[PDB]
Amino acid sequence: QKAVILDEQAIRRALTRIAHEMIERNKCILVGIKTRGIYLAKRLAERIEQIEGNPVTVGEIDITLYRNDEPLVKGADIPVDITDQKVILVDDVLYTGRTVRAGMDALVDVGRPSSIQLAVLVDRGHRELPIRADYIGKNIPTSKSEKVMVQLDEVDQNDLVAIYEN
Amino acid sequence: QKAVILDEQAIRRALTRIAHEMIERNKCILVGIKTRGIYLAKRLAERIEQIEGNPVTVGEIDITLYRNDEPLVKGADIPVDITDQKVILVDDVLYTGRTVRAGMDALVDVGRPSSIQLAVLVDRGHRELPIRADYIGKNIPTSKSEKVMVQLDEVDQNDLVAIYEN
Numbered sequence: 001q002k003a004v005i006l007d008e009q010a011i012r013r014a015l016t017r018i019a020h021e022m023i024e025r026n027k028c029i030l031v032g033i034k035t036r037g038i039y040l041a042k043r044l045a046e047r048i049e050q051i052e053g054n055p056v057t058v059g060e061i062d063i064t065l066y067r068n069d070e071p072l073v074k075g076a077d078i079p080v081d082i083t084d085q086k087v088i089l090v091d092d093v094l095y096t097g098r099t100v101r102a103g104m105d106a107l108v109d110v111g112r113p114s115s116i117q118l119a120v121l122v123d124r125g126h127r128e129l130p131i132r133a134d135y136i137g138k139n140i141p142t143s144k145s146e147k148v149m150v151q152l153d154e155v156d157q158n159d160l161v162a163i164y165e166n
Numbered sequence: 167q168k169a170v171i172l173d174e175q176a177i178r179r180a181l182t183r184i185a186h187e188m189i190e191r192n193k194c195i196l197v198g199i200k201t202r203g204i205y206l207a208k209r210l211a212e213r214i215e216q217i218e219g220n221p222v223t224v225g226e227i228d229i230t231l232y233r234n235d236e237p238l239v240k241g242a243d244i245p246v247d248i249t250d251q252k253v254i255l256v257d258d259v260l261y262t263g264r265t266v267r268a269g270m271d272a273l274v275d276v277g278r279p280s281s282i283q284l285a286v287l288v289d290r291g292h293r294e295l296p297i298r299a300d301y302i303g304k305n306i307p308t309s310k311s312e313k314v315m316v317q318l319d320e321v322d323q324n325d326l327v328a329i330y331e332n
């Protein structure tokens with residue numbers, strides 16, 4: 001048993017809305033966290049380029065969770081200097097915030113960004129840290145037992161966001 | 167030229183409201199950051215004990231800012247284990263969020279808290295990180311040039327929160 005919250009079209013509209021919001025708020029480098037966060041950052045960069053006309057750099061931080069979910073940073077690949085620049089971390093599902101914390105720490109170690117923002121496709125609540133997203137595709141109230149999973153063509157061969165019961 | 171936003175009585179009411187909110191949300195260890203954040207944590211612990219009847223532990227993280235304000239952690243003194251516990255960082259004025267980030271990092275290094283919340287006397291906006299407070303005494307919209315300063319009896323011999331122009 002699962003419930004589809006966002007289909008492919010809903011994901012597309014959310015990503016397009018986020019791209020527009022980013023453009024409006026910032027007149028920037030996108031850095032994905034988690035496997036799907038990285039694919040989402042690449043989609044957002046493509047949307048921003050199609051809207052604004054100029055290239056958007058995409059980097060990634062490679063992070064893995066472990067059960068205090070202590071996520072470890074394996075490595076980071078950001079192809080340009082982030083010092084004095086605005087970086088927007090891109091996440092698929094904002095939950096406890098522990099992966100985002102790890103990503104922020106990785107960024108402040110590789111450079112001195114002027115600011116770090118956070119864009120997420122879904123925010124399911126239940127933060128365990130004082131972390132909030134600046135851009136959100138869809139807020140989804142969830143119980144602590146439910147799981148939220150994003151499927152993307154690049155990894156799962158389909159685009160969908162679904163909620164599952166314990 | 168300065169404008170008083172909160173007088174002693176307003177600070178007292180804010181701290182009392184925050185204590186009540188903490189009690190309601192959490193049925194916990196308070197850790198102050200910044201000189202005034204530490205004094206505020208001690209006041210909150212006293213209010214919670216007077217409301218609930220049980221002692222509240224107070225710790226502190228010693229952090230200093232430097233102009234990417236890179237705040238450095240000099241040391242931390244938390245008198246009890248924070249592993250598997252809820253810790254609430256206490257800050258005087260939430261601004262860029264860079265001091266809070268440093269405090270969270272210090273905490274996850276000394277233990278494995280189940281969660282970290284953030285209580286602030288004032289939130290003046292202008293975050294440079296995806297950080298949000300869970301408890302706020304007063305929100306104060308400010309321009310980027312204005313400064314917000316909290317005075318406490320323990321440090322400044324008077325209780326007041328004031329805004330100053332560039």
Ligand SMILES: [Sm+3]
Binds near residue numbers: 007
């Ligand atoms: Sm539909």
Ligand SMILES: [Sm+3]
Binds near residue numbers: 008153159
């Ligand atoms: Sm597709």
Ligand SMILES: [Sm+3]
Binds near residue numbers: 173
């Ligand atoms: Sm008055």
Ligand SMILES: [Sm+3]
Binds near residue numbers: 174
């Ligand atoms: Sm007083």
